[PDB]
Design a binder for these strands. Structure first.
Ligand code: K
Ligand code: K
Ligand code: K
Ligand code: K
Ligand code: K
Ligand code: K
Ligand code: K
Ligand code: K
Ligand code: K
Ligand code: K
Ligand code: K
Ligand code: MG
Ligand code: MG
Ligand code: MG
Ligand code: MG
Ligand code: MG
Ligand code: MG
Ligand code: MG
Ligand code: MG
Ligand code: MG
Ligand code: MG
Ligand code: MG
Ligand code: MG
Ligand code: MG
Ligand code: MG
Ligand code: MG
Ligand code: MG
Ligand code: MG
Ligand code: MG
Ligand code: MG
Ligand code: MG
Ligand code: MG
Ligand code: MG
Ligand code: MG
Ligand code: MG
Ligand code: MG
Ligand code: MG
Ligand code: MG
Ligand code: MG
Ligand code: MG
Lengths: 184, 147, 261
RNA sequence: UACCUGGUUGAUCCUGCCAGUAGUCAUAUGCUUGUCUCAAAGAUUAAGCCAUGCAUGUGUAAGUAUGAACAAAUAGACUGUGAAACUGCGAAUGGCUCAUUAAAUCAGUUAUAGUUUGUUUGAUGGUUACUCGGAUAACCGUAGUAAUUCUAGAGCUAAUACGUGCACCCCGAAAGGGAUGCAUUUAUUAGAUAGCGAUGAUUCAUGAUAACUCGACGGAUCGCACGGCCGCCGGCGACGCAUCAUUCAAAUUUCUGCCCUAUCAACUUUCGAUGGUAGGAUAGUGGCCUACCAUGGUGGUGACGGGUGACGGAGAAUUAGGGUUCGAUUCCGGAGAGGGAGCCUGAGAAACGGCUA
RNA sequence: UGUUACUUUGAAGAAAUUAGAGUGCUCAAAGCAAGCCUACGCUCUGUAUACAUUAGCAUGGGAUAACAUUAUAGGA
RNA sequence: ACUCCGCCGGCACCUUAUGAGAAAUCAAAGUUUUUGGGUUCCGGGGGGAGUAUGGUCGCAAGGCUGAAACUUAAAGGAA
RNA sequence: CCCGUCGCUCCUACCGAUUGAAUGAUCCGGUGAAAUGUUCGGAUCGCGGUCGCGAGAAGUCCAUUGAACCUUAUCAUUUAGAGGAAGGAGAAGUCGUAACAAGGUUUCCGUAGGUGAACCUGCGGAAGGAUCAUUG
């Protein structure tokens, strides 16, 4: 099957390598997951070397995404793949791979923001909410996309390896970089 | 800027969007640029501690450790991107004739942007994990030719 | 091979076992255990080749399956159990108790012990690090793991382990001036005072040891085992006391023995 | 034993080879052969083809007995032995051979801070339950086929088989609630200094926090012994699950080193050649693979190609010294099982006394 | 702190083979045994040691030799 | 211009062996079993044969590079 | 003593029309088993309240790995060949006499032309010459 050996490669000088042994099981590869965004979740269990387990996600719809500046992580629905640095064909096929830029539902984070800062984007409770409002700062670029209900996010997990699609909300100069790539 | 690829390049684990400031924190914390000492008596160049380049294969700011053999040689080719060919000259002993013959070996090595190198310069390379099909070494020091 | 080798050819067995080359095609393959297969003495060798209690491979099994042999205070029934340096072997029926120590020629010697001295052993500390829940632990070179060790214990130190309480009674820091034994290499079995430690960044650390008679020899840190603080070891040594004699000196003793004996 | 002798001339001194002399753990063959010890033996040509038999099975007091089994006894679940069968484990070692293979294998020397590892050993696993459910083998009895440890249907009944299941932080009218084992995945945070561990060197070991997963995890198991409290409590073992360390190992890997040939001088790169970035895959590193980008990489210090009646080494023969030749074969490493390819099971195989083409 | 070769010593290094110590298998090729006295045994019985290119690792030496370097000193 | 003494460089010659060599002979062809200043080319019994073949150069003639099968007990040097 | 053609026998090799032949290997292309992943499919079984839930075979779809066969091409090794032609060996063939003496034209090198054959001739060169020698 798929093999990760170097025997089929050319030498650094350019000469060929004559085969001196058959393929080994301990140097195999496997078919890519090609995880897609779909509400029909499907993750198949793969037995790997040592009797260990890998989770190969064929279809996913939700992910665990973290708002780094706010230090809050929420499970949210994945809406769309918008950018992929490796292959633009993975964008129109809606493939979920590590480091792909996706849009996630902003609703779970809005609820936390309202519950935490008391703002939309009980005597002892109002005492602390206003206290936390003193040091409240929200990026203009990050707030502008709360109106549409979608947040740009980057997948930080490997769905074909762990079976999950987790990530973090884009912000700072990383958000500026990617939103300029989408400005066409 | 250093952002020239299709993806956004950054150091892993360095959070750049923190409300607090990084003033008074160690490298790689508070959004501060991350760098480290490789040991073995080698100095961290000022160009790596105060630079803005992103190189995950850099020995001082990347994610590669130096362990194994430390070798020296002369820069033979500096035409690849962040990779050079190091020529190592040595003598092979011919037993029957009790004499020597000159031999050489070309060792590919990764060079981080913090180093400036030209053909003929003397370089020291430290072994690291495989970085490509042929590269197993990282440049640790460059001495300009004629110095 | 497609997996693990289960056989040991007799000529490939460690030389310090002193197995005759024509005794058979195979040697006992040491089982997995606290000591490495090249630095151990399987119980079958001890019971049959060293002590002569068993005459054959079969008889060693009979002795062990009666639960008559203990290693480090616990009964062992595995014929190829890897008993190694500082291990205490006890045979209650014969009232015997031995400690595995190297003689000055590098071979394991069954050093008879007193009942009082057979209640502990020395172990070399491999490393100290935090485990799960931030609980510190140390592991030794005989496969043991001790949780909540004294914070002063560091790598390469020696700990005195009580075989009853299974706790660290006392420890010796690794430092120049202590008496050590060599546990590997050319100088295996030699005892001396650690005189110097030469560190080489990225490379092996060399230790210079001086014998009681002024003979100085070097070796790697991994082959050193501290036996006591200062100059007195905490364990009983064999007759040679780690003093390696020249072949000329050894021949001199043999000649004198024939004149007297 | 640091050795030479015959042969060119009518004769001489040379160059020079032919021939002789001796050995070979060196093969064959010829003739001959009483005794003791020791001992190689279908490698060379055909990794050509194979009749027949055998070379891998396995039972402890301790997983499962209602044989319509045996033995010894005599209103009891069973509890003497135990075929068969299920379950578990092993069959990846060993043995054989040298076909392919020329910086490859391999040797010495490294590295894994680049990974996996049944087992052994050590340590470590939170503050209907007086015990759940449905199947199936052996057995039993209807069979099919020329036929195979080829095969269908029916009736029974077990488990350590199979499937289940008791088992600090946030919100907040400080009540109440949420989360709260271990593992999994991501993000934020601490990991100082010269309370606070290690390295030549790691945002490392490890901690805290926010969530996440539709988690083969966290004992519905067995033997022996009976005791101590007034139903309660309790001994020594067996087997099994998970985590770390250890051991047994592998995989990949650093440096240097290989015979003849130039009547082999350029080779590599569209379809990976050299490197870069981002992914995918893998136990994990890596053009290992994909997308995009750059134009590199090797070479008279012999690349590339060709030859080998080439597996490599430890070693063997002969050796004043230097050297020449050999190394299929019992030790180590590799490789293969008529030729290729593919794969299941499993801790471990691209397995062949396993399967598929 | 210019970089090397060379040399010295040491560490690490499979066994078997080779060299070699001990030992009267009757000798020998071998083998790794045995020996001592006569008790309920002893000699802690023995099963040494050297060699092991080249490359790599680490100390001492600095003659010989290689490369690098020098005056608008970016000198001490 | 010629005569005499000398120095450096050159083409040579003559005598001689304390040298070398199989000798002829050589002041280098010496300083070599008491064997080593540096470096290039090149030979390994006689033939087959500078032939066949391949490559390369040339308008051609040919040049450069260059085998094997097989054959033979000598061929050859000096005296 | 000795050279070559010619003539006879045998041995080795070479050239050679045959778009020679055989065998083996490799490249590209074509076709493509099987397996695996994916898509669809839902025989059948079980479990709940004649609708749900779970499991799921055959088959099918795309992709991957990829044996195998069939081309053209190239290379390797072996081999046939009318005829041409080389070398060597084979007691005692034919024709001359070219080399050895100043060998009867001194011999030899390079080159060119010519002749049955060795060889001859032209041009330049060498002594390994038959001259170390004419201040006559
Ligand atoms: K293997
Ligand atoms: K198995
Ligand atoms: K090696
Ligand atoms: K080799
Ligand atoms: K990888
Ligand atoms: K890459
Ligand atoms: K298994
Ligand atoms: K003159
Ligand atoms: K003439
Ligand atoms: K003449
Ligand atoms: K003429
Ligand atoms: Mg095997
Ligand atoms: Mg290290
Ligand atoms: Mg000789
Ligand atoms: Mg004669
Ligand atoms: Mg001869
Ligand atoms: Mg007799
Ligand atoms: Mg069974
Ligand atoms: Mg080759
Ligand atoms: Mg190599
Ligand atoms: Mg960490
Ligand atoms: Mg990558
Ligand atoms: Mg590509
Ligand atoms: Mg060979
Ligand atoms: Mg072969
Ligand atoms: Mg061999
Ligand atoms: Mg062979
Ligand atoms: Mg054989
Ligand atoms: Mg073998
Ligand atoms: Mg195999
Ligand atoms: Mg066969
Ligand atoms: Mg197979
Ligand atoms: Mg077979
Ligand atoms: Mg087999
Ligand atoms: Mg003269
Ligand atoms: Mg000479
Ligand atoms: Mg000749
Ligand atoms: Mg004439
Ligand atoms: Mg005439
Ligand atoms: Mg004439």
């Amino acid at each position: 099957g798929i093999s990760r050996d170097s025997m089929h490669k050319r030498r650094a000088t350019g000469g060929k390598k004559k085969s001196w042994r058959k393929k080994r099981k301990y140097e195999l590869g496997r078919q890519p997951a090609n995880t897609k965004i779909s509400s029909n979740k499907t993750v198949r269990r793969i037995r790997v070397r040592g009797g260990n387990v890998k989770w190969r996600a064929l279809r996913l719809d939700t992910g665990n995404f973290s708002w780094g500046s706010e230090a809050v992580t929420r499970k949210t629905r994945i809406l769309d793949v918008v950018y992929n640095a490796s292959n633009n064909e993975l964008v129109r096929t809606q493939t979920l791979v590590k480091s792909a830029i996706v849009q996630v539902d902003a609703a779970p984070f809005k609820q936390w923001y309202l519950q935490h800062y008391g703002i939309d984007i009980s005597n002892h409770v109002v005492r602390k909410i206003e206290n936390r409002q003193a040091d409240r700062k929200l990026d203009s670029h990050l707030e502008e996309q709360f109106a549409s209900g979608r947040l740009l996010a980057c997948i930080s997990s490997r769905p074909g390896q762990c079976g999950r699609a987790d990530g973090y909300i884009l912000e700072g100069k990383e958000l500026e970089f990617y939103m300029k790539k989408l400005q066409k | 800027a250093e952002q020239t690829e299709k993806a956004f390049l950054k150091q892993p684990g360095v959070f750049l969007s923190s409300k607090k400031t990084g003033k008074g924190k160690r490298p790689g914390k508070g959004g501060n640029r991350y760098f480290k000492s490789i040991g073995l008596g080698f100095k961290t160049p000022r160009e790596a501690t105060e630079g803005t380049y992103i190189d995950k294969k850099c020995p001082f700011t990347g994610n590669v450790s130096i362990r194994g053999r430390i070798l020296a040689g002369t820069c033979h080719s500096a035409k690849m991107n962040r990779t050079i060919i190091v020529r190592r000259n040595y003598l092979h002993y011919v037993k029957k004739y009790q004499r020597y013959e000159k031999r050489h070996s070309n060792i590919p090595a990764h060079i981080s942007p913090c180093f400036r190198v030209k053909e003929g310069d003397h370089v020291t390379i430290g072994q690291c994990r495989p970085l490509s099909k042929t590269v197993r070494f990282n440049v640790l020091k460059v001495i300009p030719a004629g110095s | 091979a497609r997996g693990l080798k289960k056989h040991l050819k007799r000529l490939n067995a460690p030389k310090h076992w002193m197995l005759d080359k024509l005794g058979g095609a195979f040697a006992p393959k040491p089982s997995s255990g606290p000591h490495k297969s090249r630095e151990c003495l399987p119980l079958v060798i001890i019971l049959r080749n060293r002590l002569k209690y068993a005459l054959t491979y079969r008889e060693v099994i009979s002795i062990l399956m009666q639960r008559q042999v203990m290693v480090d205070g616990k009964v062992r029934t595995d014929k190829t159990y890897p008993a190694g340096f500082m291990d205490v072997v006890t045979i209650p029926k014969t009232n015997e108790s031995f400690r595995l120590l190297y003689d000055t020629k590098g071979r394991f010697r069954l050093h008879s012990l007193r009942d009082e001295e057979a209640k502990f052993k020395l172990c070399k500390v491999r490393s100290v690090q935090f485990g799960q829940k931030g609980i510190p632990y140390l592991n030794t070179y005989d496969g043991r793991t001790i949780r909540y060790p004294d914070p002063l214990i560091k790598a390469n130190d020696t700990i005195k382990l009580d075989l009853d309480s299974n706790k660290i009674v006392d420890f010796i820091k690794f430092d120049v001036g202590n008496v050590v034994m060599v546990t590997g290499g050319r100088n295996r079995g030699r005892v001396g005072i650690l005189k110097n430690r030469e560190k080489h960044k990225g490379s092996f650390e060399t230790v210079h040891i001086q014998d009681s008679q002024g003979h100085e020899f070097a070796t790697r840190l991994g082959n050193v085992f501290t036996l006591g603080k200062g100059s007195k070891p905490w364990v009983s040594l064999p007759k040679g006391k780690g003093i390696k004699l020249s072949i000329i000196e050894e021949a001199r003793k043999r000649m004198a023995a024939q004149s007297a004996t």
